[PDB]
Design a protein around this nucleic acid. Structure first.
Ligand SMILES: [Mn+2]
Ligand SMILES: [Mn+2]
Ligand SMILES: [Mn+2]
Ligand SMILES: [Mn+2]
Ligand SMILES: [N+]
Ligand SMILES: [N+]
Ligand SMILES: [Zn+2]
Ligand SMILES: [Zn+2]
Lengths: 368, 180, 368, 180
DNA sequence: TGCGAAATTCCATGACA
DNA sequence: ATTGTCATGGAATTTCGCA
DNA sequence: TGCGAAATTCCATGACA
DNA sequence: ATTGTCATGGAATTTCGCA
């Protein structure tokens, strides 16, 4: 403050203040003649308050804050002080957007067998059809083979009724879903344990995580739409038609229909493939086992030029889920306890609870 | 001749009437000929309409080339004939009053009777588990269960315990008591 | 049909059917032994129906359709026939997504003078504040200088009341807005003509077109949010504070505040720039005129690797604006009358009306 | 000494009472000293509160270093003093009862009177156009209008016609009739 | 051991949430 | 305590039919 | 006529619709 | 009959302070 600025006025050298400019008193303040003009050098003790007044005018970031200050002031390493405040502005931290993208997506392995994993989800509400408003969509992870059930609500009870009908055929090892009320209820938990089924949940608000079923929803709606062109939206009677139609459609990249991947032979449906007519069932199944292992698997794409990947003990912020109007889009900062994989983390949320969370719902807190 | 395959032939039949379970009285039985895989559907009657309603569910998953049945009224109606024709399913009838399938239908009748006793009215709920049992039951002729043959894989519900399937002492007496 | 297939069975050459494979009769049909297996060759007269039955199973595109057919059939140039049908499937054409991106955005010139152009828009509804729910945002094109007015509705009448207050200061040449009810009403048209103001409209559902104000909305909400952290959302009293705060904030890329760009001198606000203290007003204004011409101008970015640009007489489809559930996302095909610029077109919509339309709300109809 | 600039000094004053126009009686007059640019605000009273309410609008656009006024009650109140202090505006008073600004205030009084006749009650609506006129009016001393000086550009509403500003024969007689 | 055309594969784009 | 996906239709690349 | 650090500029990212 | 925009904060690049 007044200590540092004293030695300066007489003309001795202090670290940070370049010796080649002339520093003087005038109007009761220490000044300095810089190329841009004459600026006041405030005492170290005044600087925090200044940076703060500047930043608070419009809660501006680094440069826009600095340009306000530089209008009247100069001191050594001004931006360092600006950045210090930005890092401590609760309001900027929870309101500003990020400008670093997530790391590149994972392409988890395809389940090895049919019934290893189901992805499940609800579509709707849809226009009423015979008093029904939702569709339960169950997608086998390995085959893509999909079951459709109309329901009146996305409820646990309607979920159980449908899955009892489906699990008549086979019981899956795992069933993966989002954290919706219907799948997280204890009633559903019991129903699963009762059967040796493990429940897997997607991180919250990240449907990419159950992308298989989300994606299948797209085909389901797309085909319903086409079949409903210029007629009233009576979808109930078409569920069975759509289910069959999709289960027997080729994926160009795989060169197989989900039906084939499930049974290794077409049923009596139009254009049934006949290639294995002369093989015994047992020979057929052996060629199926081979087909299942050799399916195309996508690889993780290149990182975008400005991504971040989570590091343990990093300060990060979770996105507010359903933020009210004129309220911040981000939660207060929190700490990365564990890096489950490069795209998934456990955070201690300052309450503090352990939350498992996608990096897509995260930003790295700015200014360290 | 080409080898036998799944979906080549479905064998359907009704079982009932049974005691009322949640409004249902009968069971449509569908057994795939090659695999011995069984599907069961509760109906309220052995009618053409109940058959079409149930088969619509099944034929949403897989369509047989041929359906085989006895000459039950539900199966010989021309409604049912029209239904099959619409789906390119050829219909096939055993002559009136006259292998692997036959045994399966025995297993089903018997396994029902077993569990139907003590709870003659709760069978609707048991259909799923009955099927799972039937379908993960080892076939002495083939080295495989119907599940294995259908899907080419082991199942997550193996029924390692082959059961009595026979009626114990307590049950014979309370089956002779229920039917009084 | 039976003509072409006849010469073939005897073993003579027809264009399209390779001479090196053996073609024969069996079961009443012409067959052929191809590497993949034995396929039926249908008569030319049967082929359209086949392609159609195949395509209709799940309304599948090129490959997924072809793979169904190839299960039973072979004929010359099968895909050509598949593509012919896809091009005539009304339902596929209006339901499928595009897979070609728009051409690269234009960066129109900055208005040369303050008051040359205003961009205007409404924000809201917002939580009630003193009975107010909307904000009228008026942004000067050249300066960024922005006026804020709270309103009860996004109505013409409230628009006129506000613009009368603002145009007390100066009258603009042009006022640009979206095609909202409030700006397209005849009452507003009259109010503008009455004053020598030209009305400019954005193409429909393309706010990028008035991006200046849309973007300013973001800062307006962002700053209101920060100032409202942990207090009840009483925004009415803050409009004047926000307006001032923003008008006097630096754009890092320009190195100027909109206020400076408008007046060439700061008013009595915190951290007022003093660089022109010694110049006469007239010298100041002369340096302002120079500053205004030399502002940074962004350039049009690179095209994405698979973009399309509109060509006159091309078949294209306009996106349905507020499509109902399970209804197509695209209108029927239509023709490009005029290419206004590479990102804007006039289409005859088959009704047929002339509509001016952004290419972002367009897809090029598939399969010619 | 440094040259005169816009926002160096605002000159404010009230005009009124006037005939009721849409509930308003007075006009706060703000003239920027250097440029001669005029802002007008309708008020219901020449009170400190009406002054702060109106100046809040203006000071949302630009803030003067100094405000100059006569010793009107609205301007000498300590509420108004507190208001100015809050914004770093220094207050400046002409001594009781005692250039470019003076002429502008004349123009305003006169131009109002002109248009106020025939429609003494519709003045509220006319304020915008009155300002535009005043501000695109050529200054004989400087080569420029206040608009030009404020913004450094020509305006899209030049008032090429300098007007009588004087009261015609029909108006003198109906001003002598209205005020009866 | 090479050419023109057809077939197949590649892959950006967008939509499910 | 967990993780994107895949139909689509022009373009790019490979294969086929023929010498 | 070159070094280390500070200042400035670059620019991807995302959010307004 | 018309058209994206720009605050943001790490990284990249340039400039400064000094010999
Ligand atoms: Mn029978
Ligand atoms: Mn006075
Ligand atoms: Mn979903
Ligand atoms: Mn908007
Ligand atoms: N994995
Ligand atoms: N332009
Ligand atoms: Zn802040
Ligand atoms: Zn189609």
């Amino acid at each position: 403050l007044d200590a540092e600025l004293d030695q300066l006025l007489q003309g001795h050298y202090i670290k940070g203040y370049p010796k080649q400019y002339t520093y003087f008193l005038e109007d009761g303040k220490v000044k300095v003649s810089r190329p841009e003009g004459v600026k006041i050098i405030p005492p170290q003790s005044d600087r925090q308050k200044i940076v703060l007044q500047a930043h608070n005018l419009a809660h501006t970031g680094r440069e826009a804050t600095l340009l306000k200050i530089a209008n009247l002031y100069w001191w050594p390493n001004m931006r360092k002080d600006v950045v210090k405040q930005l890092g401590r502005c609760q309001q900027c931290l929870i309101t500003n957007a990020s400008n670093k993208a997530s790391g590149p997506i994972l392409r988890p392995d395809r389940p090895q067998k049919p019934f290893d994993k189901f992805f499940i989800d609800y579509i709707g509400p849809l226009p009423p059809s015979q008093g029904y408003l939702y569709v339960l969509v169950v997608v086998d992870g390995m085959t893509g083979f999909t079951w459709l059930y109309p329901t009146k609500a996305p409820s646990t009870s309607a979920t159980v009724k449908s899955l009892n009908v489906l699990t008549s055929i086979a019981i899956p090892k795992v069933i993966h879903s989002d954290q919706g009320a219907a799948f997280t209820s204890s009633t559903f938990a019991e129903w699963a344990k009762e059967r040796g089924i493990h429940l897997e949940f997607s991180t919250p608000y990240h449907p990419q995580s159950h992308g298989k079923v989300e994606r299948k929803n797209s085909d389901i709606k797309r085909l319903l739409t086409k079949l409903l062109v210029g007629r009233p939206t009576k979808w109930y009677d078409l569920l069975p038609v759509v289910q069959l139609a999709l289960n027997n459609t080729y994926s160009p990249v795989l060169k197989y229909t989900p039906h084939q991947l499930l049974f290794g032979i077409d049923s009596n449906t139009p254009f049934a493939n006949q290639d294995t007519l002369d093989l015994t069932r047992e020979e057929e199944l052996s060629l199926l086992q081979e087909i299942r292992t050799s399916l195309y698997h996508p690889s993780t794409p290149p990182a975008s030029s400005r991504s971040w990947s989570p590091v343990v003990g990093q300060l990060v912020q979770e996105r507010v889920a359903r933020p009210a109007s004129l309220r911040p889009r981000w939660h207060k900062p929190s700490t990365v306890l564990k890096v489950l994989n490069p795209r998934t983390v456990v955070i201690l949320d300052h309450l503090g609870n352990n939350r498992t969370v996608s990096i897509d719902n995260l930003k790295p807190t700015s200014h360290q | 001749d080409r080898p036998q395959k799944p979906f080549d032939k479905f064998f359907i039949d009704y079982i009932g009437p049974l005691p009322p379970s949640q409004g249902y009285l009968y069971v449509l039985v569908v057994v795939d000929g090659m695999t011995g895989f069984t599907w069961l559907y509760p109906t309220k009657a052995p009618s053409t309409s109940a058959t079409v309603k149930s088969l619509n569910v099944l034929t949403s998953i897989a369509i047989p080339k041929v359906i085989h049945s006895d000459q039950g009224a539900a199966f010989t109606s021309s409604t049912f004939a029209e239904w099959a024709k619409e789906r390119g399913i050829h219909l096939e009838f055993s002559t009136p009053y006259h292998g692997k399938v036959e045994r399966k239908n025995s297993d089903i009748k018997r396994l029902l009777t077993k569990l139907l006793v003590g709870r003659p009215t709760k069978w609707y709920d048991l259909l799923p588990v009955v099927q799972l049992a039937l379908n993960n039951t080892y076939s002495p002729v083939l080295k495989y269960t119907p599940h294995q043959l259908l899907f080419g894989i082991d199942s997550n519900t193996p029924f390692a315990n082959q059961d009595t399937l026979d009626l114990t002492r307590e049950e014979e007496l309370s089956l002779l008591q229920e039917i009084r």
